[PDB]
Design goal:
- The structure is a homodimer.
- Chain A is mainly alpha-helical.
- Chain A folds into two domains: about 40 residues, Laminin, CATH 2.10.25.10; about 525 residues, Myeloperoxidase, subunit C (Orthogonal Bundle).
- In chain A, about 40% of the residues lie in helices and about 5% in strands.
- Chain A has a two-stranded antiparallel sheet with strand order 1-2.
- The interface between A and B is large, with 55 and 55 residues.
- Bound molecules: a molecule of 2 linked components (NAG-NAG) (2 copies), octyl beta-D-glucopyranoside (2 copies), ibuprofen (IBP) (2 copies) and 2-acetamido-2-deoxy-beta-D-glucopyranose (NAG) (4 copies).
- Chains A, B: Belongs to the prostaglandin G/H synthase family.
- Chains A, B: This is Prostaglandin G/H synthase 2.
Chain lengths: ~550, ~550
């Protein structure tokens, strides 16, 4: 019924119904005009000729290693490139946010209600004939069939880029601070009202939980020492709510910021490292400021760890994931003379695309043990038996799975993967090609162009019939990967805007915050600007073991 | 004890303790360097020579009426001036926000906790020797004595600018949507978690209250008709919580967005006008979109009324209050090529300076009745007896009191005025001269320079001894007014940054929102861009009576 169901407006023009069977497109500041915003302005069709494809840019960034070695050592030139990366990626994100799962039009409810995930594309209206608007059949293909035919893993497919379990668990630990779906309300709702990197997974979402976790001395968090090494406090000693099965011992009920981090020993590893890091910074600050009280010590340390996190995510995590030879840079100063909104709202589509289930291996290998999913889940005693040093040594060398390419979702989590498909449909996501156009990509003209092969493409065409009906999430997992890469084109061109915007949109990156006094002086400031994934492990893990997000990296001496 | 108690850092440099008896100033991006950020950079002392005083600028803006008539009719030039007004005023406001009543340093608690009012200046630390830091005596002078000697009204002093009760009640109705002090927690806390113009005083702070107020037909709010004219629904028919004394009839318990708007018939007048305006816009939208449902009709109308409000506040309310001959302009487009944060946090100091108690008259005059404060309070039957048309006619011609100048606070509200002084001290406000320097003003060297006279200045010197100890709020009320103006220098130079930032920092002013489709097409968009205080009354009050914020304005025909 709704005349906008066909998604007629192009180039980010907004569709509005003007009667029962008529629409109008708002082409304001899109660079286009005409009934569907498809006729380019003069300056627009000029930029369209010069603009290189995402695959062309990707090639240049992952080749010519010698040239980039020159660029990386020219500070003014490195700053210029990184500045363009930040601004060009951010422009794809609406800030202030607009639509959500219940609003295909802008409203004050959609803007102010922080319990929603925001939406990069408005949901398909309820009164549309087909799930994707007007194209395709009345029902989408069986999610169970899609899962079994192109998604399930027959044999483990390793990541060509060499991403290890240090990476996989960092990814899950880091993103679980702003990907906290409120399942009481629905998949379109969140419990992370910070909508970004506030480190609530360390300090707790609410003030009540924060105070239960704090020691109220030297600004430190509560802790216990087992075998000479520091671990999170117990549920008994703190009274914070954690999710543990009833058969778990009292001593092993670790209490951390996020309540689900007891699920995996891999998550509790990072929970422990950051806990040590917080208290480490506390003592350093107390050294500089013997006149400070507990409160200022805690708060300043939290700001520093926020800085450390963004520093690490950009210059180590994203750096590895990008595969670029260009040396990325965390420098808030780069945006001081640019137009940029220091705010961010977590998009539902960001949550969906980050469901990197193929990352998980068949077993978790520590020392000479091959723990299964059954053995690994909720077993914190594994962490105490081996210790963090052993965990780092083992996980640095265990490779993770290839996300794109298809048929690599471990069967142990097939229910979670199916849920990602169903909830995607429940939230009325638009098609893959609609999201590709949203992020300046050419739509796929066939299933073969999508997968880059024949066998999986044929299975999908039998299920979907039309390429313009193909769903976003399963496409991301079956998409033809870039040569020797972990991702396809769609994952990067969608993920990058969300990711970089969420990191730089933090208030500590704003000019009024980004100064030494905010972080307790030059010493505290330097902790942020020199932070790295290696230094984090080196300072907080026994023996200062070698670590990296890449199994391919040689360990010296 | 705290080495920063003396407020040593100048020009918005940040003070940090570096030991028990030492401090360091962060002069980053202040334009100054040196131990106290007082030594100008070369480019800084150049700008300092060219920059005219606030009083010089005020003179030029309130004189040369013939020249401004020329400027006002040159669109490109009018746009250029207004752009400079917006950007220069906004630069004085920290966005993202920083300090609050409990944090003299930046912290994540101060940033994320929306229940606080933010602070333009950090509070005086608890362990300081004197209330204002180091200067003055151990105790501030008796608030009751300050109130009676320089604040209380001996005889009504009318506003020279001619502000009427249409103005006074608009001011109280408008600002009560973001000045909602949570007295359960303290004076430093708020219930308006929108921190701006969200019109929660019309639609309710929470979704539950919003739904009780809505009709769920045509996007309209609930209403009743009495004597042919429309009024808000009752508490009985809606079950929303209103604050009424137990002796008020059932029919007279009007239910509106803000729960305290039953207090004054003047407030309920504007509550009624905006209620009619919402439903008026609903029908206009339904005309354009017969295919729209109740929800989209309500939401779009709310966005339009938000636009109308900001339009009216800038081009009528602030226009009158400023006394400028320059024709101000609400145009979000002016900031599209500028650096500006579309967000805002309500400052506690904004709340304090807006306590314009001298505005209130001795009696409220409607027709030939002279209602007292006792008779006027909670008496909605006054509103029904006379009607809105009568209210507008009478209030347009009744003059309000002069805010600055001193000795004009009505004795009926002396308790509220005293509370403003006490709570100001409780929240550990810094001195007047510290706030003047914060907003680029020269400190007052004596009490006589402050008041511009001798009698009140002498009374203050006996109470405070030092001019650098004079408090902010009582200074604002006794300050020497500009010639024939309602305010002194401090009220304008503090109020203007807060005010303009709060209006333009709204998300509907952002590029992604500011387009016809957001407001239901060109028709809805035009409602905003043509809105005025006269057209608001004309469209929603019987007979389309003449109205204005100035008693001096002649009524035609
Ligand atoms: C934000 O949106 C959610 C979802 O609509 C609101 O939660 C609803 O609240 C009403 C009553 O206020 C309940 O009857 C519904 O069951 C809730 N829905 C869901 C899905 O939980 C919420 O009230 C809105 N406002 C705020 C401030 O969160
Ligand atoms: C925001 O700040 C307020 C004030 O500190 C917090 O309210 C306190 O909450 C604790 C428990 O959470 C109570 O014991 C205190 O009595 C409260 N203080 C006041 C003054 O009301 C609030 O919890 C903070 N966090 C949020 C999310 O609002
Ligand atoms: C080659 C010099 C460094 C360029 C770094 C830019 C990397 C990200 O650039 C991206 O390019 C895409 C394709 O052009 C665009 O669609 C995106 O908007 C842009 O962010
Ligand atoms: C004369 C041409 C129009 C100028 C309009 C500027 C009005 C507000 O200008 C104000 O001037 C003050 C004193 O210089 C400054 O302290 C403020 O930062 C600035 O906002
Ligand atoms: C896909 C996303 C989650 C990770 C990612 C990968 C690459 C980049 C680079 C810096 C880019 O913006 O091109 C950013 C973020
Ligand atoms: C004092 C404040 C509450 C009202 C006010 C008065 C004047 C102005 C002008 C536009 C200015 O910025 O100079 C803005 C706001
Ligand atoms: C706009 O799109 C509609 C359907 O999406 C199509 O019928 C129409 O021809 C298009 N208009 C132009 C000018 O291309
Ligand atoms: C947890 O691991 C320990 C070895 O550290 C093992 O003995 C135990 O059986 C495991 N628990 C489960 C439920 O697999
Ligand atoms: C800075 O201020 C302190 C006290 O406020 C004063 O003693 C000192 O001399 C000042 N330093 C300079 C360089 O003016
Ligand atoms: C309210 O006003 C009416 C006149 O409209 C008057 O009769 C009544 O006494 C007033 N009530 C109070 C409490 O003053």
């Amino acid at each position: 019924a709704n005349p906008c169901c066909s998604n007629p407006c192009q180039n980010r023009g907004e569709c509005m119904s003007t009667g029962f069977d008529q629409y109008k497109c708002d082409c304001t500041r899109t660079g286009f005009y005409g009934e569907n915003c498809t006729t380019p302005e003069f300056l627009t069709r000029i930029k369209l000729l010069l603009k290189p494809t995402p695959n062309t840019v990707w090639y240049i960034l992952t080749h010519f290693k010698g040239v980039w070695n020159i660029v990386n050592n020219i500070p003014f030139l490195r700053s210029l490139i990184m500045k363009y990366v930040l601004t060009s990626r951010s422009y794809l994100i609406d800030s202030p946010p607009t639509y959500n799962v219940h609003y295909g039009y802008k409203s004050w409810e959609a803007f102010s209600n922080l319990s929603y995930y925001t939406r990069a594309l408005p949901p398909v209206a309820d009164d549309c004939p087909t799930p994707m608007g007007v194209k395709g059949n009345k029902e989408l293909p069986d999610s169970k069939e899609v899962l079994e035919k192109v998604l399930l893993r027959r044999e483990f497919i390793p990541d060509p880029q060499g991403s290890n379990m240090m990476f996989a668990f960092f990814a899950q630990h880091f993103t679980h601070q702003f990907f906290k779906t409120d399942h009481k309300r629905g998949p379109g709702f969140t419990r992370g009202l910070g909508h970004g990197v506030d480190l609530n997974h360390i300090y707790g979402e609410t003030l009540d939980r924060q105070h239960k976790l704090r020691l109220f001395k030297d600004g430190k968090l509560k802790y216990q020492v087992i075998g000479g090494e520091v671990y999170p406090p117990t549920v008994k000693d703190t009274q914070v709510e954690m999710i543990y099965p009833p058969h778990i011992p009292e001593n092993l009920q670790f209490a951390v910021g996020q309540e689900v981090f007891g699920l995996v020993p891999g998550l509790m590893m990072y929970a422990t490292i950051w806990l040590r890091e917080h208290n480490r910074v506390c003592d350093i600050l107390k050294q500089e400021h013997p006149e400070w009280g507990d409160e200022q010590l805690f708060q300043t340390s939290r700001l520093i760890l926020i800085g450390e996190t963004i520093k690490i995510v950009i210059e180590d995590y994203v750096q590895h994931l990008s595969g670029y030879h260009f040396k990325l840079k965390f420098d808030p100063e780069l945006l001081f003379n640019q137009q940029f909104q220091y705010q961010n709202r977590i998009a539902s589509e960001f949550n969906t695309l980050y469901h990197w289930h193929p990352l998980l291996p068949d077993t978790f290998n520590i020392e000479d043990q091959e723990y299964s999913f059954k053995q690994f889940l909720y077993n914190n005693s594994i962490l105490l038996e081996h210790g963090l040093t052993q965990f780092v040594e083992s996980f640095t060398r265990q490779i993770a799975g290839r996300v794109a390419g298809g048929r690599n979702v471990p069967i142990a989590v097939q229910a979670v993967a199916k849920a990602s498909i169903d909830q995607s449909r429940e939230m009325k996501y638009q098609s893959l090609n609609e999201y590709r156009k949203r992020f300046s990509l050419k739509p796929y003209t066939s299933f073969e162009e999508l997968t880059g092969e024949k066998e999986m493409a044929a299975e999908l065409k039998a299920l979907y019939s039309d390429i313009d009906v193909m769903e976003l999430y399963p496409a991301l997992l079956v998409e033809k990967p870039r040569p020797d890469a972990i991702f396809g084109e769609t994952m990067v061109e969608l993920g990058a805007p969300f990711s970089l915007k969420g990191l730089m949109g933090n208030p500590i990156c704003s000019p009024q915050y980004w100064k030494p006094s905010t972080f307790g002086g030059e010493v505290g400031f330097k902790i942020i600007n020199t932070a790295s994934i290696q230094s984090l492990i080196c300072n907080n893990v026994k023996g200062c073991p070698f670590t990296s997000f890449n199994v391919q990296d040689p360990q010296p001496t």
